[PDB]
Each structure stands twice: as C-alpha cells, then as structure tokens.
Amino acid sequence: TEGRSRDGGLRLGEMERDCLIGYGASMLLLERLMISSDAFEVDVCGQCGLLGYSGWCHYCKSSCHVSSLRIPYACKLLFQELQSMNIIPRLKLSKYN
C-alpha cells in the first residue's frame, strides 16, 4: 500500500533503479523489483505463444508445449489488459542456453 497510514512499504523510484542499473546488479534488481514486489507463476505454450494454466493450453487444446515462467504480476495484468483490446501478445520463448 501507500505508506505508514496504510502500512505500505517504501517505493523504488525510477532513480533508484537507475542507480542499480549503473552498478549492474542484475540479479539484485530482478529480485527487488519482481520477487519482493509481485511474483507470479505463468504457463506458456510454445506452439501458440499464449498464456496457459496448470501446465495446460486452452487455445491449442493441448499440454505438449507448456512451460513454467516467473513473472511480475503487473506484467501479467498488462498482458491480459492488452488481450482485452484484441491486441493479443504471442510470447516466443527461447531456451536459456
């Protein structure tokens, strides 16, 4: 929430993230802004490129290309909001190696 009157934590302003980038603390920045703010688990079908649930793909009606992915909850909300406008985001996954 907002602050002390609302028992809210502090806010990482843009400048703080700028300093973190300048230091290059990639994993620390990722943990601070994703793990410690809003962490979510999503499933993506490589065939369709669309989000899925519980290792299942409704659009492809299959579960042979699902995968797990950690995400900011705000990012998932943005994806779904963009979906509502029929601007469908198709995620093209790639192996980490």
Binding site: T1, E2, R6, D7
Partner: protein, 55 residues
Amino acid sequence: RCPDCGSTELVEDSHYSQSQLVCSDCGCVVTEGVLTTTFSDEGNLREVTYSRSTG
C-alpha cells in the same frame, strides 16, 4: 479448523501489519494475507445500489 490436528481453535491475531489465521494448538497457519481496497482506488470507483442495479 486445523488440517492435521483437527482443532477448531483458530483465532485471528494482528501481526506486524499482517492479517492471518493461526491455530493456537499447533501454531500452524491456515490462511494468511488479505486483500483490501486502497483510498486512491476507493475514490475513483463508484458505489452501486440494489435498486439501480435491478432497474
């Protein structure tokens, strides 16, 4: 109720600004975290009444 011991003695206690349900017998938590509307959102959203909703 307690999932393991079955004790129904679940009590609500206020932690360091965290609402959660914990069993007093085994100290095991059964439900934590609560979702409440913020003032910045409560000021924008509009309340609806039963009459106008039903027509």
